[PDB]
């Protein structure tokens, strides 16, 4: 289809600091990709982001009932929804499954790449480390980054560029809020 | 901060498409199906603890529909610029022969939120067992999308995620095959 498209977006945002101690509420309006007016609980009124949203800022700021609704959103909307979903969102904990397998950087005879597959964890914050016989190797570590599977689980590959020796023991260490002690998986040649 | 909940909505002309969803730290809590007027929880366990009245969402899309007409006039009918997507194909877990797995097609950084996605195995459209997500919001206000295909790893099967978008001249094919 060649016909031009026209897109409108609205985003009601709730930003939480230390639980529900400090809460920030944003009411943002977008034409295509461009925000043109927003309400911010730090201000208490609508403010035009671009000249396109100035009529809506003055029009909405003249409606005190509307403004009183937006000023109460941190209590009736943000803290409320946080309380409804905190059991399966804020407190969701899934520990990862850790798999180690060798690979090749280039078509070589021997393997020169140790992959540490860390799959299915939540939340996303995680720290993965490589050790060669109990000594951490910070050189030659390449990662795929934090991959979002889109189903409330994350995954990441952390690869070590190394030439394995006989009797060498590598171990991949994983730290995650779902764990109380570091998860380790070892690999030897 | 430490947690962000976003109620994201959009309306699109002339497609007359509307969406309403909740985002938590980048994951979808639920969305409302406009046709059935139902709350759809991303994980079915979510519906056992929380509920949502789906008509409040349609009332918002009705206002977003009216605001879009106002903003289109205000911008002198300035249309949107197509931003083509980045496409990545990957598996849910490390691949083992004849051990079940899931193919994930990640479509990212694109607008408008219209896309045609096709899973191909050996160059043929596959429909069995596929699933997808609604259009998910980005902080740069583009969109992201997920498509899934459970499969059994075999050395004789190759796959492709074919993505069409008005910002693309040719359909984007992202390949996957077993080592």
């Amino acid at each position: 289809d060649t016909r031009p498209r026209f897109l409108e977006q609205v985003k009601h945002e709730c930003h939480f600091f230390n639980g529900t101690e400090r809460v920030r509420f944003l009411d943002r309006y977008f034409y295509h990709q461009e925000e043109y007016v927003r309400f911010d609980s730090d201000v208490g009124e609508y403010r035009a982001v671009t000249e396109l949203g100035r009529p809506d800022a003055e029009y909405w700021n003249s409606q005190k009932d509307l403004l009183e609704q937006k000023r109460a959103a941190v209590d009736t909307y943000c803290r409320h929804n946080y309380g409804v979903g905190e059991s399966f969102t804020v407190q969701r904990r899934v520990y990862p499954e850790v798999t180690v397998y060798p690979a090749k950087t280039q078509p070589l005879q021997h393997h020169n790449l140790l992959v540490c597959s860390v799959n299915g964890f939540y939340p996303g914050s995680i720290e993965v480390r490589w050790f060669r016989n109990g000594q951490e190797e910070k050189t030659g570590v390449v990662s795929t980054g934090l991959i979002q599977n889109g189903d409330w689980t994350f995954q990441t590959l952390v690869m070590l560029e190394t030439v394995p020796r006989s009797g060498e023991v590598y171990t991949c260490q994983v730290e995650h809020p779902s764990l109380t002690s570091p998860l380790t998986v070892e690999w030897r040649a | 901060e430490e947690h962000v909940i976003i109620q994201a909505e959009f309306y699109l002309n002339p497609d007359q498409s509307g969406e309403f969803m909740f985002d938590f730290d980048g994951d979808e809590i639920f969305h409302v199906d406009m046709a059935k007027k139902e709350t759809v929880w991303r994980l079915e366990e979510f519906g056992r603890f929380a509920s949502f009245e789906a008509q409040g969402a349609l009332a918002n899309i009705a206002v977003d529909k009216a605001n879009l007409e106002i903003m289109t006039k205000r911008s002198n009918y300035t249309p949107i610029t197509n931003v083509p997507p980045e496409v990545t194909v990957l598996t849910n877990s490390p691949v083992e022969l004849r051990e079940p797995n899931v193919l994930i097609c990640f479509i990212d950084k694109f607008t408008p939120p219209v896309v045609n996605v096709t899973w191909l195995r050996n160059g043929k459209p596959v429909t069995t067992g596929v699933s997808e997500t609604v259009f998910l919001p980005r902080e740069d206000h583009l969109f992201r999308k997920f498509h899934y295909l459970p499969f059994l790893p075999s050395t004789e099967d190759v796959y492709d995620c074919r993505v069409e978008h008005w910002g693309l001249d040719e359909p984007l094919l992202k390949h996957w095959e077993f080592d």
């Binding site: 309006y29 009529p55 509307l66 | 309403f20 809590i29 009245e53 009332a59 106002i70």
Partner: peptide, 13 residues
């Protein structure tokens, strides 16, 4: 245990 939606503000005109 219902999640509250926030109202969209109707623009001018």
């Amino acid at each position: 245990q219902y999640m509250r939606a926030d109202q969209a503000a109707g623009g001018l005109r």
